[PDB]
Amino acid sequence: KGKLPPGPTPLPFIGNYLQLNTEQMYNSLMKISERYGPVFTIHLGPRRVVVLCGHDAVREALVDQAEEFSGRGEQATFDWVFKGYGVVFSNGERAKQLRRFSIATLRDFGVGKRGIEERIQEEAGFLIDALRGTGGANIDPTFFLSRTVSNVISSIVFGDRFDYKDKEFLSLLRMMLGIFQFTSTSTGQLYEMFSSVMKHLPGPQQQAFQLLQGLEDFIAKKVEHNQRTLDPNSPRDFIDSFLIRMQEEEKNPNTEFYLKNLVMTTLNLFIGGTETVSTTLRYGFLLLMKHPEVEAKVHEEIDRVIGKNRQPKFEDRAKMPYMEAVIHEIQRFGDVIPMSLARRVKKDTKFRDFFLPKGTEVYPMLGSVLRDPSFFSNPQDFNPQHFLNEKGQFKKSDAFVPFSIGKRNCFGEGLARMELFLFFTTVMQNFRLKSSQSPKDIDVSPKHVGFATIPRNYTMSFLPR
């Protein structure tokens, strides 16, 4: 029965609203940690949350006490559509079934294997083609990168990749993009505290709902399409494998394989498989143009190990320590999902002499692990040396946790690291990156930080080398 972690006294309903700047949630919670310690209690409106800061607090909970911290908490904006259904927002039995099935089915369509390495190499080549065809003109790379990324997971879950022509495609991409931005604003973070009121009020949360509805309707139309052209012995994509598994479980009335879980799971993958990698690429190029010395070492190393002729491949990894360090440092620096997705204690839990009642939400401050001064000698700088030893060979970090850790850690990690290596490598093989402004003027502080870290709007050009 010990005590909850210390933290500032909340008000009825508003919680710790007075100590929170919803524009800068992460900076807010970190200011509070400086006063209360690395483990503290915050009230996000009426949501009682335990916040974990620094590598040690986060590894201790999510790894050393893995089972106890394995429950899924809420993200309220996403909840509006998912409603506890689908792999990401589910718990207990639902969670174990959808994750085990999702991981396996991803692996059946080539994730972690030559299959998807081919699909990514191919789709990369299509990206090179498009950036050439701009002929060095000053463009917004946003939808160039995200079309390419989205087409990879799209081929896995929908079968065939989207034609760049498709107007529905861009529409979906705008939708995904506007949701990531919304959830990263003051208002999206205010919604995390006050959703039981705000869901019924007018404002930018109404528009973010319409985008979620947009994505749900598109997935439900693709499912429909898949069902009535289905072939039970030869699955065409993820949706088919879940349709089939649905059919096998018409006997079991306690099954988790029904329509709503298929829709929401496919939506999770589509969304998860698109926006984070895409935001990482986009920040990544921005960082590279700001650090032209880094771009030159990368260029130097691409030329010696790969040269201009062949397609980069995943194994090149092993022989490119400086590129792996660059991509590691883009992820670390980007901090794209700075507060993870919320966890929940699965039962009454003891954790460092605090007591956590069953159901308490947990915030793993992944951003604080990526910036932990005990693991990286210059947290606020972009410096690939963070992941290099004395001998310029790749150096692992225990604080490299952009995908989180523990039992509900990101299972798209393997796909992502593959897409990131290949897309970054192939793009810089063919282009030098040319900024709109001089390196000293490039602003890499974020536009929005909340659920995600969003880079500022920018333009650039892609010049042949």
Ligand code: HEM
């Ligand atoms: C830059 C790439 C990515 C980053 C930084 C990232 C980040 C994260 C984080 C921080 C979590 C929460 C894990 C936890 O609760 O401990 C998560 C979960 C998840 N991710 Fe990713 N992710 C990425 C890519 C992907 C991709 C490509 C997919 C699609 C295949 C994907 C699908 C998912 C799913 C389905 C979950 C829910 C895990 C569960 O509840 O069991 N992610 N991700």
Ligand SMILES: CN1CCC[C@H]1c1cccnc1
């Ligand atoms: C933000 N994401 C990256 C991995 C999980 C994914 C996500 C988050 C919220 C809803 N669906 C998918």
